Design a protein around this ligand. Structure first.
Ligand SMILES: O=C(O)c1cccc(C(=O)O)c1
Ligand SMILES: O=C(O)c1cccc(C(=O)O)c1
Ligand SMILES: O=C(O)c1cccc(C(=O)O)c1
Ligand code: FES
Ligand code: FES
Ligand code: FES
Ligand SMILES: [Fe+2]
Ligand SMILES: [Fe+2]
Ligand SMILES: [Fe+2]
Lengths: 435, 435, 435
C-alpha cells in the first residue's frame, strides 16, 4: 500500500489488513511473528517444577506450558498425538507430560519419551514442543523454524534485576495490531487519559502533563532504527520549545513508552492469541534503582498501565465488555474522565475493544496523528510479505534493542532526530530523559 | 410468488423469504423500510440534553442516539471515522459527540464539527447522522435518501396528547416479520390468549371475549388502503351476526389492533434490529380522554401488550428464552393458560421466539387464518422489489394514517368492507367501535 | 480406508471421518443409525400421561416426547406445520399435542387430528411422528423408513426386570463416536481410571484390578459377530495366564463392558444429538438378582459410570467444561487421580470433551490399543456407505444381542476366541465371567 493517498495517509487495503491481522499458523504475519521470541506466560504461573500445566494459546496455536521436574519452563502443544486429548489432563512429572488416556508421554521439547502401547512408534507421536527462556519474569518461547532461532530479547526490562521490573498481562478481546497501535499514538494520551494522568501514581505531578493536556495535535517524526522505529511525537511544549515524546517501537510488538518524569519507565508488548484476541503485556521498570514497595503495590493494585482483574486467577480485567468498563457518566460530565471509563489501561482497551475484534480498516480515516501507526504498519507488512520471499526480517539482533525512550524539551530549532543520534547513544547506560 | 398454490395459500419461496426478512443496509427490504420514519428510541431514554448517548441498532445499522446540548434528539453512527472506536465513549456536549480517542467531534447531523489533528480534513470524517422527530414519545429517525424523507407519521397515537398514549419497547429475539405477523393474525387470540383475556385489565369483561373464545376460525376480508391493508377478521359473533375484528395494518410495521370494549386502544410497530432480532413496540392510547392512573400503572406494570422486564434498565422481558417464559404446566392443565405461558406479549413472543430467529418459510403450511399475513407479505414483497425498480413505495403520506381500528357486530348481510367506507370515514374524529 | 497404513493402524481420511461423524438427517451415518431403535428419552421423564412434553433432539432432528392420554409414549417433531412454532407450547391432551398458536393438533404418530381453520387441509399438516417402545426404562424410537422398522432391542438390560437394571443419561458436549470409542478402549482403564477403580463401589476390591493397574498394554483380538464385534482385550494377567477383558460392541452404539467381579454388570449406548453433541447412556444391570438398595443409591448418587449432575432437572454433569471437571492438582500429585479429575465418567468425558466436539481424525496417531476402535470404525463406515448402496445393515436382528461380556483368566495357550464359542454360547442363561 502507498504511504499517502489523496494527501491524507493511506488506509489499509483488504489484502494488507489481513497480511497484518491474520496471525494463524502458516500465514504472512503468522510466519513473520513466529521468528521472534514470543512472551508466552509469566514464570509466576508455572513457578513450581512438576507444577500445574497452564493452557496458553499463542499466534492461534493452542499450547501448554509447564516446568519440567528439572526446573525447565517448556511449551508443548496442548493435544496428544494418540487421540487428540488435551495434555492439560496429562501428568507433569519425570521431565515430561504423560497424557491421561493411554499413557503416552511428552518431553518438554515435545518428543515422545514413552509410548506404552508400541515403544517402536515413539517418533510418530512427536508433538510441537518449542524452546523457552526466562527473561523479564516472562517465559519466552521460540516458534519459528529451528534454524532461525534468534538471541533472547535484550530490552532493558528483560536484563535489569527482577526487583527493577514489573510485568503484567491483561486479556484483551481484540486483535494485537489495534491494541499495539494505542501504544504508538501519543495523541490519545491528551484526550482519553487527560484527567487520569493527574490521578494515577505513575503519571502524576510532572511538568510534561501540562504540555500533554494542551497540545493534543502531535506532529510525528519517525526514524527507522534496526530495532524498529523511533517515534518523535512532537507536541507544543513551551512557546520556545517542543515537548518531544520519544516512544521506541521495538519491532514487532513492544513499546517503550516515553517517561513521565522521575516516575518508573513504562512499556508494552502485544502477543496475539488469535486473529480476534491478544495478550496485552505491561512492563514498568526503573533503571538506576529497584521498584519501591510503594511503586510495586500500586502497580500490583492495577494502577498505571497495569489493570485490576475481575477475580483472582483471571487475566480478564475487572472493567470489561460486560461491566461497561464501569462507565461513569457522572464522571464524564464532572470532567474526571473523557471516555467515562476510569483507569489507564481500561480507558485504552475499552476503545480498542469497542472497534470490534478487528477494526474496519476499510473505513479508517487516518490522520496526521497516525504517522507512527502507518509507518509501523508498512514496516510490518513489508517484513511479512518479505519473509514470504525468503527475506530475513528486521530487529532479530537483540543487542540493538539496548534502548530507552525519552521525553525532552527541544527548542523548535533542534531537529529531534539529530538530538537522539547525539544524546541517546548507549541510552541504557545514561540517565533517562524526562519532561 | 403467486397468491394461491394448490388451493391453499402460498408459502414464501426462498428469494421472497429473504426479500422480506433480510433488512441489512442496501437490501431489498432494507432499502424499502428505510424510506419510512423508523421508531429508534424512546425519548424517555435520552430525556436529558447532553445526556448519556444510548446505543441503538436499527435495520442492521449500529447507531447512537443523543440529545444535543440544544435539546435535539439526534442519531449518529456509533463508530468514529478516525479509527472506528465507538462514539459511545465520546462526549455528548457542545451540540455534538466528541470521540474519546483523538478528539474528533460529530454533529447531530453527523458532520465533523472539529478534527483536532487536520482541521482541513473535516469533510472526510463525516459519519452517518440521520434526522429525527419527537412523535409518540418515540424518537423517529429517517434513514432513506435525503430527498425521499417523508412527513413524520400521523397515527392517532403519534398525534394525541402524551397523557393519552402509552409506549413500550420489548426486545424480541426474532426477525421483525414473524413478530408482526402475530399482530395480523386475530385467530391466535382465540387459542393462545384464550384465558388471559379474562384476567388482563385491557381485555377483560367485554362481550367480544365470548365471541373470540368461541369461533377461532377467522375468515378474513382484506381491503387494500393507501395506508396499508384493512383486515376484516370475521368470527361467528351471534347466530344473526358476525363479530368483525378490524385490524388496520399500517404499512410497513404498525398494527392498530381491534378494540376490546371501552378499554384503551392498542397497537404495535416492529423495528428490526437485524435479520434475527427486532424491537417489539406496544402503544396503548385513548382518543376521547387521557389514560387513567389505574390504566397507566397497569400498562407500566407489564400487563396488556406491555411486558415486565428482567431487570431495570433492560428491555429484555422478565419471561424470556432462559426463563422458559415461566412455563406453568400446572396452569396449562388447570386451563389458566393454553401455551403454559402467562402474560399477553409473553404468550405471543414465546411462540414467535420458538420458531427460530427466522421461521422455516419453506415448511410453512399456511391456512385460511393467514390471509392477513399473505396479503401483507405480497404487499411488502411488491413494494421492496418495486423500490428496486425505482417504484416509489406505499403509505408514505402520513395524512392517510389518520385511522382507527374497529370491532363491530354486523348482520351476516352487511358486507363489512362497505360498512367501513360508510362508518369508518374520518374515523379518528368519531367514536371507537367496540364489541 | 485400508486397515493398516505404514504398519501402524490407519487414521481416518476426511471423507471417512465425516461418513461417521456427520449424523444429520439424510447423511450416510444419519441414514444408517436411523435404521436402529434410538434411545430417545427415559420413561421417567414423561412418566405421566398427558404430562409435560420434553424436548429431545436425536440425530440432528429436534423432536418432542410425550405420553398420550392413553399412556403411549410418542415422539413427534417439535415444530408445528402451520407457522413453525414449537409444539413444546402445544397442549398434550386428548391423545395429541394441540399447538398453541392457531389450534392445530398432532397425533402421537404425528398426524393432524384437528386443523380448526381448514379441516380439509389435515393431511398437509402431517408432521414427523416416529414409533416408540418401552424397553430399558428408556423410550426407544424408530426413525428409519417405515418398512425397515426392526424388532425392539433385546440386550440383557432391555429384557431383565426393571429392578434389575439402572439407566442414566449424561449430556456430553462431543460427537457420539469419540465418546463411544472410550467404551471400546480398555487400555484407558489402566491409566485414567487407575486409582478410581479402588475407590468406586462398582469396580472396587476385585482381583481384576491388580491386572489392570499393571499391564496397560492391551493386545486386542476382535471377532466379528452378527451383533457387532467381540473385543478380547488381552492384558498380562498372571505369568501363566492372560486377563481377557471381553467387551461386546453391540452395533452401532452400545457397549457391554467387561464385568468387575461379582459387582453389577455395566454398559453404555451413545445417541448423537447432533454432529457436536451426544447423549451418553450408562446402564448397570444384575442378571441373577435385582439391584441392592445400596447398589441403587450409589448408582443414583453418580458413582460408577453414572454421574452427579449440576442441578436437579439438568442432565449436564456437575463436573463439566466450566467447572474444570474439578481438576484437583493436589490429587494428581497425591496419586489419587491420573487426569486430576475424579469420578469415572467425569474422568472419561473430560478427555473426550477436551479433544474438541470433533477430534482431529487427521492428526490421530492410532496405536495397537486402537484395534477395537478401528475395527468398529470400518464396521460402521462399511455399513453406512453400504446402506448408501441399498445394502441392508448389520445387527438389526435383536435376538442375536442376547449376549453378555466377560472377564476370564486364560492360559496363554487358550485362544480366547475359541473359548467364547465354547463357554459364551447362550451367555445370558449362564453365569457371568468375572476376574
Ligand atoms: O504513547 C504514549 O504516550 C503512552 C502513554 C501512556 C501509556 C501508553 C501505552 O502504550 O499504554 C502510551
Ligand atoms: O389481532 C388481534 O386481535 C390482537 C389482539 C391482541 C393483541 C394483538 C397484538 O398484535 O399484540 C393482536
Ligand atoms: O472398556 C472398559 O474396560 C471399561 C471400563 C469401565 C467403563 C467403561 C465405559 O465404557 O464407560 C469401559
Ligand atoms: S490421547 Fe494421549 S495417551 Fe492416548
Ligand atoms: S477514533 Fe474517534 S477520535 Fe480517533
Ligand atoms: S403454528 Fe401451530 S397452530 Fe399454527
Ligand atoms: Fe492509551
Ligand atoms: Fe398474540
Ligand atoms: Fe473410561
Amino acid at each position: 500500500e502507498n504511504l499517502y493517498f489523496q494527501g491524507h495517509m493511506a488506509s489499509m487495503n483488504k489484502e494488507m489488513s489481513e497480511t497484518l491481522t491474520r496471525v494463524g499458523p502458516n500465514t504472512r504475519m503468522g510466519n513473520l511473528l513466529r521468528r521472534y521470541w514470543v512472551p508466552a506466560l509469566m514464570s509466576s504461573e508455572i513457578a513450581e517444577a512438576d507444577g500445574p500445566q497452564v493452557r496458553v494459546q499463542l499466534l492461534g496455536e493452542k499450547l501448554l506450558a509447564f516446568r519440567n521436574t528439572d526446573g525447565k519452563a517448556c511449551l508443548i502443544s496442548e493435544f496428544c498425538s494418540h487421540r487428540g486429548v488435551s495434555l492439560y489432563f496429562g501428568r507433569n512429572e519425570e521431565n515430561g507430560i504423560r497424557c491421561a488416556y493411554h499413557g503416552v508421554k511428552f518431553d518438554g521439547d515435545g518428543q515422545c519419551v514413552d509410548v506404552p502401547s508400541s515403544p517402536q512408534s515413539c517418533a510418530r507421536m512427536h508433538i510441537k514442543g518449542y524452546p523457552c527462556v526466562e527473561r523479564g519474569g516472562i517465559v519466552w518461547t521460540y516458534m519459528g523454524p529451528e534454524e532461525h532461532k534468534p538471541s533472547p530479547p535484550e530490552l532493558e526490562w528483560c536484563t535489569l534485576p527482577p526487583e527493577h521490573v514489573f510485568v503484567s498481562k491483561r486479556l484483551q478481546y481484540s486483535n494485537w495490531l489495534q491494541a499495539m497501535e494505542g501504544g504508538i499514538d501519543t495523541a490519545h494520551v491528551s484526550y482519553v487519559h487527560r484527567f487520569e494522568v493527574d490521578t494515577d501514581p505513575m503519571h502524576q505531578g510532572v511538568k510534561a502533563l501540562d504540555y500533554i493536556k494542551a497540545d493534543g495535535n502531535v506532529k510525528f517524526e519517525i526514524e527507522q532504527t534496526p530495532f524498529g522505529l523511533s517515534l518523535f511525537g512532537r507536541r507544543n511544549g513551551e512557546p520556545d520549545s517542543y515537548y518531544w515524546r520519544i516512544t521506541q517501537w521495538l519491532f514487532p510488538w513492544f513499546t517503550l513508552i516515553a517517561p513521565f518524569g522521575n516516575h518508573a519507565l513504562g512499556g508494552h508488548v502485544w502477543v496475539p492469541i488469535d486473529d480476534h484476541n491478544c495478550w496485552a503485556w505491561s512492563i514498568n521498570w526503573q533503571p538506576d534503582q529497584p521498584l519501591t514497595k510503594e511503586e510495586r503495590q500500586s502497580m500490583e493494585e492495577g494502577k498505571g498501565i497495569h489493570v485490576e482483574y475481575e477475580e483472582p486467577g483471571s487475566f480478564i480485567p475487572k472493567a470489561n465488555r460486560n461491566n461497561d468498563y464501569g462507565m461513569d457518566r457522572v464522571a464524564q460530565r464532572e470532567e474526571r474522565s473523557y471516555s467515562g471509563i476510569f483507569g489507564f489501561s481500561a480507558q485504552d482497551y475499552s476503545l480498542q475493544e469497542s472497534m470490534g475484534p478487528i477494526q474496519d480498516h476499510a473505513a479508517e480515516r487516518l490522520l496526521p496523528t497516525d504517522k507512527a501507526i502507518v509507518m509501523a504498519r508498512r514496516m510490518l507488512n513489508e517484513a511479512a510479505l518479505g519473509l514470504e520471499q525468503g527475506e530475513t526480517p528486521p530487529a532479530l539482533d537483540a543487542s540493538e534493542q539496548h534502548v530507552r525512550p525519552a521525553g525532552v524539551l527541544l527548542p523548535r530549532d533542534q531537529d529531534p532526530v539529530a538530538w537522539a543520534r547525539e544524546e541517546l547513544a548507549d541510552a541504557t547506560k545514561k540517565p533517562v530523559f524526562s519532561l
